[PDB]
Design a protein around this ligand. Structure first.
Ligand SMILES: C[C@H](Cn1cnc2c(N)ncnc21)OCP(=O)(O)N[C@H](CC(=O)O)C(=O)O
Ligand SMILES: [Mn+2]
Ligand SMILES: [Mn+2]
Lengths: 411, 555
DNA sequence: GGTCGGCGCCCGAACAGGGACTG
DNA sequence: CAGTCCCTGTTCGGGCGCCG
C-alpha cells in the first residue's frame, strides 16, 4: 500500500546491457536458493527475453560470515541514473565521521525490500542466473522492490531512514550516522565497551522497524605514507643516482625540490659501486629536501564536484602503497598496507583487500568511491576478484601497466 | 484461430520504424512444391493464416533440405525485420559439453518436431510476419500468409523458444527433482539414477507433459539405446567422443578451405590432444579474397600431416565424477602454442584443448603460461563450476621468483610442478644491486623526426666509448640500440645506466620472445651474461656520463 | 539455392592512451 | 606551451567450425 517514487534514467541514455559472467557451483546454488526465496516473498519475479536489459549477479561472504549474500553489479545502472541520487535526493556527508575514535558499519540492505519500486523502472533491474555446463538457459528475474547495491535505494529510503533514526539521534546527539549504499556508518567518541553497546541499542532499535553484522573502524589511527629519503652515512654513485631520480620525480609534487648540488657529484663517468663523499653544498641540499617532504603540498584540497582516483603500487613482501587524488600530483591522501590476507602467496587477494580498504576509507572521509588504477592485467583480475570480494559495493576500476620507476612511495 | 496453451511473449518494434516491404526472390520449381506442401499443411494446423491486401508488408522466403531426410525446412529472410525489431537478451549463455555430464543409470534423448511451429507468436506482431508464396506460374498472384507461431529467421524466435521451453519444463522438473534434463533448444537429454522400470514411465510422463502444450516427441527421434547422438557427440555408458570429423583433401587450397579446415581442427582439439593450427593460421594473415588460391608452406604441410595422423587414432573422453578432484595439465608445444588435458584419473581425459594467443609485442613463457591457466580456469567454471588443480611444467622456485618480483599483480591457483620438458623458466635475471668490479656503461640514443637519422652509443668508467650512426630509426629504437651496444662490448658482468623509460620497461619484464628483432638480439645477449644491472637516471640533469653520452648522440 | 541465436578460434583494421620531442 | 608520432594495447567486424 506504499506509493512509489518515480525514477528516470539520465536523459539521453539507455539501460544496462552487461553479459553475465560464469559463476562457480557454490555461488549458483546460493543464488538459486536466495532467488527462490526472494520470489516467494514477492521481492523478485521471473521475466522473459523481451527485456533487453541485464546486469551481472554473483554472491559473496562478508568477513567471518558463513551466510552467502546476493550481490548485483549495478555499476553500469548507477552510472545511468547519476542525476537522481545527487541532484534531487542527495545525502549529506558529515565531515565529523572521519574524526571519531570508532566507526562501525552495519549492513542495512535488508530494509530496502520493504519499499516497492517504480513499475516503469523495474525493466532495468533485470539479471540472469547461469547454470553449470549450460544445462538450462538463463533464468531471468527483475526486482519488484528497492534492490540492494543500487544508488537509488538509499535515496528513496532516506526519508524513511531519517524518521527511524530520529528517536535514536535525539537520545544520542553526539553520535554521527552516515548512510552509503546498503551500509550504515555509526561513529562515536565513546569508550570501546559502551560504543558497541550503543550499536546494539541501534540494532534493537532497527529490529522493531522491520530489519545486523558489524565491522569496527578507527579513523583516528589512520596514518599517511610520506615520501622518505634514505639515511646513509656512506653513499655510492648508484645511491646518489637513485636519490636524484627519486627527488626529480618528487619535484612534481613539491616544487621546492632541488637536485643541482647532488647532480654535481655525478659529473664524471664513475663506477656505480664507487663511494662518493657528499660535499658541503650537497649535504645542505639533502637536509633541506628532507624538510620539504615533511611539509604539506601547497594548494591541495578536496573538490566535491570532481571524481576521486586511486592508484596502487605493488612493493613486494606484502607491501602495498596507494595514493588518492583528483588532480595529478595533488594527492588528498597517501598510505601503505602490509600483512593483509594472502600476503606472500596471493597477489589478487591482497589487491582485492587493498581496494576494499581504500574504498572504505574514501567513503568515511568524502562519501565517494574512487576509480581505481589497478596494477594488474585485465584477464588476471576479471578471473579471480569475485573469489575474494567481501563488500556490498563495487568501485570502478581500470587496468594500468607502469613498470617501476624510482620506487617513489616505498623505501 | 484457437488460443495456444503457451503464454505469448509481447514483442514490439523499435520506436519510429515500420514493418518490412521486400519483394520475393525467384524460387526454383522444386522448392516451390515443398513450400506449398508445407504451407497448406500448417494452415490446416492453424500455424499460418491467409491475409488479403490489408497487410502492406512482405518478406522473402526460401527452403533448405533437412539433414538425412526427405523433409524440407521453411526459412524466412527476416533480415529487414530484425533490423527494426526490438532488442532481446539471449538466454542461451553457452554450449553444454559432455565432459560435464555425470554418470546416470538411464539416459533418454528426444527431439521435438517442428519446435518453432508449436510456440505462439504475439497477436499484435503477426501482421509484420507477412510473406508471399510464388505459384508455378509467374502470372498467378500467389498466396499470402502470415505467421501465427515463431518463424525461422527472426531474431526473437530462439530467445522466445528457449524461455518458453524452460517455463513448460519447470512444473515437471519441480515434481521430479532427481531427473536431470539438459535443455538445449528443443533437444532434451534426460537422465536419472532411478531404476530402468520407473525411468521409462517418467519419460512417458514427460512426453505427455510436453504434449499438453503442443510439443510432440516423435518416436522416430526417440533414443533409448546407447550410443546416444547428442550435440554432435557419441555418448556411451562409460565414455564419449565427437562424431566423425572429415577434413578436406584439396590439392589446391583456397582461403575459404583453410578457414573450413582451421575450424574443424579447433573443433577436434576438445578431445584430440596435440592439435596445432599455428602454421595453418599463418596462411590467413594479410589476405583479402576468400576464393584466392594460396600454396601450403613447408611448415603448414608438416603441421597438417601431424594433425591427420592424430585424427587416425580413436580418442574418447570420460564423464565427470564429482567425488574426485579435477586436474588440468599443460604442455609447451611450439613457440607460442600450448595444449592442456583436463582429467580426473590418469590418461582418462574429460576433455583437451589448446591455447595459442600472442598478447603483446614482448612476452615470455611465464606470462603465456599464466594466460593459459586463466583460460582453462574460466572454461572449467563454465563446464564444472570449479577450478581444477594444475600440473605445470614450471619449477616452484621459478614461479616464486617471477610473481614476487613482478610489478604487476599475478597469481596461479593451487598447482604442482610436473617434470615434463620443455620446462618453463626465466632465461636471465637482472641484479637488484650494482655489481662490484663490473664495467659501468652510460648509454643513450637520439634521432631526428624528419631526417630519420640518429646515433646510439655509450661511455664507460674505463674510458671505453662508441657511437654508431643509424639510418631510418626513431628515438625509441636508438635507445634500445644503445643498450644493445653496451651488451655486445661488455664482459660477462656489466652495469648499464640508461634514461629510457621505454627501453627499461621492456627489459625488466624479462622477455624471451619479441616481435622486434632488435629486442630479440638484446634478449640473446642478456642470456649470455652472468650479472646484468640496469638502472634509470633522469635525462638532461647532468648526471654521470649520461650527459656526456647525450651530447655525443645529440645529432 | 545465402535466415536466426548461442559459444569457440583466427585475422586486420579501427580505436586509444601514454611518453618524448618540438613550434 | 599544444602539436605530432612512435609505440603498445584494446575493442570490434567478419570468416569458419559446432549445435538446435
Ligand atoms: C527451428 C529450431 C532451431 N533451428 C535449427 N536449424 C535452424 C535454422 N537453419 N534456422 C533457424 N533456426 C533453426 O529447431 C527446431 P527442429 O525443426 O526440431 N530442427 C531442424 C534441424 C535439422 O534437423 O536439420 C530444423 O529446424 O530444420
Ligand atoms: Mn526438433
Ligand atoms: Mn636519449
Amino acid at each position: 500500500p506504499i506509493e512509489t517514487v518515480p525514477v528516470k534514467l539520465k536523459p539521453g541514455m539507455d539501460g544496462p546491457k552487461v553479459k553475465q559472467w560464469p559463476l562457480t557451483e557454490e555461488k549458483i546454488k546460493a543464488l538459486v536458493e536466495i532467488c527462490t526465496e526472494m520470489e516467494k516473498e514477492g521481492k523478485i519475479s521471473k521475466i522473459g527475453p523481451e527485456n533487453p536489459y541485464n546486469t551481472p549477479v554473483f554472491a559473496i561472504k562478508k568477513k567471518d560470515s558463513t551466510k552467502w549474500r546476493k550481490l548485483v553489479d549495478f555499476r553500469e545502472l548507477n552510472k545511468r541514473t547519476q542525476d537522481f541520487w545527487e541532484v534531487q535526493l542527495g545525502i549529506p556527508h558529515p565531515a565529523g565521521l572521519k574524526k571519531k575514535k570508532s566507526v562501525t558499519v552495519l549492513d542495512v540492505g535488508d530494509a530496502y525490500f520493504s519499499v516497492p519500486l517504480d513499475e516503469d523502472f523495474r525493466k532495468y533491474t533485470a539479471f540472469t542466473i547461469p547454470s553449470i555446463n549450460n544445462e538450462t538457459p538463463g533464468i531471468r528475474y527483475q526486482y519488484n522492490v528497492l534492490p540492494q547495491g543500487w544508488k537509488g535505494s538509499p535515496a528513496i529510503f532516506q526519508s524513511s531512514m531519517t524518521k527511524i533514526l530520529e528517536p535514536f539521534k535525539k537520545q544520542n546527539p553526539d553520535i554521527v550516522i552516515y548512510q552509503y549504499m546498503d551500509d550504515l556508518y555509526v561513529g562515536s567518541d565513546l569508550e570501546i565497551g559502551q560504543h558497541r553497546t550503543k550499536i546494539e541499542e541501534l540494532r534493537q532499535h532497527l529490529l522493531r522497524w522491520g530489519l545486523w553484522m558489524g565491522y569496527e573502524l578507527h579513523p583516528d589511527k589512520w596514518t599517511v605514507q610520506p615520501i622518505v629519503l634514505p639515511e646513509k652515512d656512506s653513499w655510492t654513485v648508484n645511491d646518489i643516482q637513485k636519490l636524484v631520480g627519486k627527488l626529480n620525480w618528487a619535484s612534481q609534487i613539491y616544487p621546492g625540490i632541488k637536485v643541482r648540488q647532488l647532480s654535481k657529484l655525478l659529473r664524471g663517468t664513475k663506477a656505480l659501486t664507487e663511494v662518493i663523499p657528499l660535499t658541503e653544498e650537497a649535504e645542505l641540499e639533502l637536509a633541506e629536501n628532507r624538510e620539504i617532504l615533511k611539509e604539506p603540498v601547497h594548494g591541495v584540497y578536496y573538490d566535491p564536484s570532481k571524481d576521486l582516483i586511486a592508484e596502487i603500487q605493488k612493493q613486494g613482501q606484502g607491501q602495498w602503497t596507494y595514493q588518492i587524488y583528483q588532480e595529478p600530483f595533488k594527492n588528498l591522501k597517501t598510505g601503505k598496507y602490509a600483512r593483509m590476507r594472502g600476503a606472500h602467496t596471493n597477489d589478487v587477494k591482497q589487491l582485492t583487500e587493498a581496494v576494499q580498504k581504500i574504498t572504505t576509507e574514501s567513503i568515511v572521509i568524502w562519501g565517494k568511491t574512487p576509480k581505481f588504477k589497478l596494477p594488474i592485467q585485465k584477464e588476471t583480475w576479471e578471473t579471480w576478484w569475485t573469489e575474494y570480494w567481501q563488500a556490498t559495493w563495487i568501485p570502478e576500476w581500470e587496468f594500468v601497466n607502469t613498470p617501476p620507476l624510482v620506487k617513489l612511495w616505498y623505501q | 484461430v484457437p488460443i495456444s496453451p503457451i503464454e505469448t511473449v509481447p514483442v514490439k518494434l523499435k520506436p519510429g520504424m515500420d514493418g518490412p516491404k521486400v519483394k520475393q526472390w525467384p524460387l526454383t520449381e522444386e522448392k516451390i512444391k515443398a513450400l506449398v506442401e508445407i504451407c497448406t499443411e500448417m494452415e490446416k494446423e492453424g500455424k499460418i493464416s491467409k491475409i488479403g491486401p490489408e497487410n502492406p508488408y512482405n518478406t522473402p522466403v526460401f527452403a533448405i533440405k533437412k539433414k538425412d531426410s526427405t523433409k524440407w525446412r521453411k526459412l524466412v529472410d527476416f533480415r529487414e525485420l530484425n533490423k527494426r525489431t526490438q532488442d532481446f537478451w539471449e538466454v542461451q549463455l553457452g554450449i553444454p559439453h559432455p565432459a560435464g555430464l555425470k554418470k546416470k543409470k538411464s539416459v533418454t534423448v528426444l527431439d521435438v518436431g517442428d519446435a518453432y511451429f508449436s510456440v505462439p507468436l504475439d497477436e499484435d506482431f503477426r501482421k509484420y510476419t507477412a510473406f508471399t508464396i510464388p505459384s508455378i506460374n509467374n502470372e498467378t498472384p500467389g498466396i499470402r500468409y502470415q505467421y501465427n507461431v515463431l518463424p525461422q529467421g527472426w531474431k526473437g524466435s530462439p530467445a522466445i523458444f528457449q524461455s518458453s521451453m524452460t517455463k513448460i519444463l519447470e512444473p515437471f522438473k519441480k515434481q521430479n527433482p532427481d531427473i536431470v534434463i539438459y535443455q538445449y533448444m528443443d533437444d532434451l537429454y534426460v537422465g536419472s539414477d532411478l531404476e530402468i522400470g520407473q525411468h521409462r514411465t517418467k519419460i512417458e510422463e514427460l512426453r505427455q507433459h510436453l504434449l499438453r502444450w503442443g510439443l510432440t516427441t516423435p518416436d522416430k527421434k526417440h533414443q533409448k539405446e546407447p550410443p546416444f547422438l547428442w550435440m554432435g557427440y557419441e555418448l556411451h555408458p562409460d565414455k564419449w567422443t565427437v562424431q566423425p570429423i572429415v577434413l578436406p583433401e584439396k590439392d589446391s587450397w583456397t582461403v575459404n578451405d583453410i578457414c573450413k579446415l582451421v575450424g574443424k581442427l579447433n573443433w577436434a582439439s576438445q578431445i584430440y590432444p596435440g592439435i596445432k593450427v599455428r602454421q595453418l593460421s599463418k596462411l590467413l594473415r594479410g589476405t583479402k579474397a576468400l576464393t584466392e588460391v594460396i600454396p601450403l608452406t613447408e611448415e603448414a604441410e608438416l603441421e597438417l600431416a601431424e594433425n591427420r595422423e592424430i585424427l587416425k587414432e580413436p580418442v574418447h573422453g570420460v564423464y565427470y565424477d564429482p567425488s574426485k578432484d579435477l586436474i588440468a595439465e599443460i604442455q609447451k608445444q611450439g613457440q607460442g602454442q600450448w595444449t592442456y588435458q583436463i582429467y580426473q584419473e590418469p590418461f582418462k581425459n574429460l576433455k583437451t584443448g589448446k591455447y595459442a594467443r600472442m598478447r603483446g609485442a614482448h612476452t615470455n613463457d611465464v606470462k603465456q603460461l599464466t594466460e593459459a591457466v586463466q583460460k582453462i580456469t574460466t572454461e572449467s567454471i563454465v563446464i564444472w563450476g570449479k577450478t581444477p588443480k594444475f600440473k605445470l611444467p614450471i619449477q616452484k622456485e621459478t614461479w616464486e621468483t617471477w610473481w614476487t618480483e613482478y610489478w604487476q599483480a599475478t597469481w596461479i591457483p593451487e598447482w604442482e610442478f610436473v617434470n615434463t620438458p620443455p620446462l618453463v623458466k626465466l632465461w636471465y635475471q637482472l641484479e637488484k644491486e650494482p655489481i662490484v668490479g663490473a664495467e659501468t656503461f652510460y648509454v643513450d640514443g637520439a634521432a631526428n623526426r624528419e631526417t630519420k637519422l640518429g646515433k646510439a652509443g655509450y661511455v664507460t668508467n674505463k674510458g671505453r666509448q662508441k657511437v654508431v650512426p643509424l639510418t631510418n630509426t626513431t628515438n625509441q629504437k636508438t635507445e634500445l640500440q644503445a643498450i644493445y651496444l653496451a651488451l655486445q662490448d661488455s664482459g660477462l658482468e656489466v652495469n648499464i645506466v640508461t634514461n629510457s623509460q621505454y627501453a627499461l620497461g621492456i627489459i625488466q619484464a624479462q622477455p624471451d620472445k619479441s616481435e622486434s628483432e632488435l629486442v630479440n638480439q638484446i634478449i640473446e645477449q642478456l642470456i649470455k651474461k652472468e650479472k646484468v644491472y640496469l638502472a634509470w637516471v633522469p635525462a638532461h640533469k647532468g648526471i654521470g656520463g649520461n650527459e656526456q653520452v647525450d651530447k655525443l648522440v645529440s645529432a
